[PDB]
């Protein structure tokens, strides 16, 4: 159906596979998602090869990540155009304790949980960075 | 970009509506018209032309299904042994319903015709 779930799982399996990089098709919500993670420095960059007048849109993602291990220990999709979780501002279940962040899609723009508290917020979790 | 490349290759606007326009009025065949020429010229049409007004097209899909149905209907009337083919009649008629739900939503008269347009045309 979507493309978004394929992105989180393809990175996590790749970190394990030990690889030079990733390539995949991007899709519309999927490109919007990605950028937030990089900013917290899980990833060096990404660039979409042919942004303009093209059928699919394909994204080559620059990994942060080998030499030695990585940065993005686990990206595991909770919601990521997958499944319909919900979070409130008050109701914040999360794993990891702290070391890690949660990405919420919200009315405003994206951001981390910790920043999202300062605004207040809620949305649906995309995935868990441990 | 995609449209611009073919713009250099072809020849030019105004002329392209007229070349295409003839073949369509003769009898349908949007795909056919399109393979004639001078392809480099024809290549631009989706890329620049909106898409013309035409008879048929939305109707074609239904028309063909009914065309096929009648022929199969004799083969279902004769000998009963037809276990594979029957489902096909069930697939095609039904592929017409499947198209008929979205195709009904933009225009008028697709709603009246499309229901009716099994087992008539």
């Amino acid at each position: 159906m979507t493309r978004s779930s394929v992105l989180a799982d393809a990175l996590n399996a790749i970190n394990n596979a030990e690889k030079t990089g990733k390539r995949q098709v991007l899709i519309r919500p999927s490109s919007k998602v990605i950028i937030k993670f990089l900013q917290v420095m899980q990833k060096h960059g990404y660039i979409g090869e042919f942004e303009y007048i093209d059928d699919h849109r394909s994204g080559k993602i620059v990994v942060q990540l080998n030499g030695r291990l990585n940065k993005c220990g686990v990206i595991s999709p909770r919601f990521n155009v997958k499944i319909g979780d919900i979070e409130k501002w008050t109701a914040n279940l999360l794993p990891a304790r702290q070391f890690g962040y949660v990405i919420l899609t919200t009315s405003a723009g994206i951001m981390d949980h910790e920043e999202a508290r300062r605004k207040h917020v809620s949305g649906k979790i995309l995935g868990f960075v441990y | 970009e995609s449209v611009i490349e073919q713009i250099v290759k072809y020849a030019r606007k105004g002329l392209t509506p007229s070349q295409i326009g003839v073949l369509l009025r003769d009898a349908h065949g949007v795909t056919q018209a399109r393979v004639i020429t001078g392809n480099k010229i024809m290549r631009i049409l989706k890329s620049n032309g909106l898409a013309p007004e035409i008879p048929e097209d939305l109707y074609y899909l239904i028309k063909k299904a009914v065309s096929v149905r009648k022929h199969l209907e004799r083969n279902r009337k004769d000998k009963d042994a037809k276990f594979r083919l029957i489902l096909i009649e069930s697939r095609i008629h039904r592929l017409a319903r499947y198209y008929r739900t979205v195709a009904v939503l933009p225009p008028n008269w697709k709603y009246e015709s499309a229901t009716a347009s099994a087992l008539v045309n």
Binding site: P77, R78, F79, K82, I83, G84, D85, I86 | -
Partner: protein
């Protein structure tokens, strides 16, 4: 993930609600096939002995009793020895072995 459904909307989520109800294996609202009740006092006048199980041996002394809440079943007697007289009324716990 999650659960299977996304919780997307428009009259969905209704399906799982049906599953919980059909499905509950044990005895439903209370049980009163026979029975319960903290003392249900059957006055019985049959004293007999029944067997025990396949792999051991033994022969217990039991007394059958007819309940107030109409039923005749075999009841076990706890303690060593016993005497039991006119009826009488002996109050039963109704524990499961």
């Amino acid at each position: 993930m999650g659960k299977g459904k996304p919780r997307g909307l428009n009259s969905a989520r209704k399906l799982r609600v049906h599953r919980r109800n059909n499905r509950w294996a044990e005895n439903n609202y209370k049980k009163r096939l026979l029975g319960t009740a903290f003392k249900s006092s059957p006055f019985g006048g049959s004293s007999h002995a029944k067997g025990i199980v396949l792999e051991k041996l033994g022969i217990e002394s039991k007394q059958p009793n007819s309940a107030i809440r109409k039923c005749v079943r075999v009841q076990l007697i706890k303690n060593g020895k016993k005497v039991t007289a006119f009826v009488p009324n002996d109050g039963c716990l109704n524990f499961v072995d």
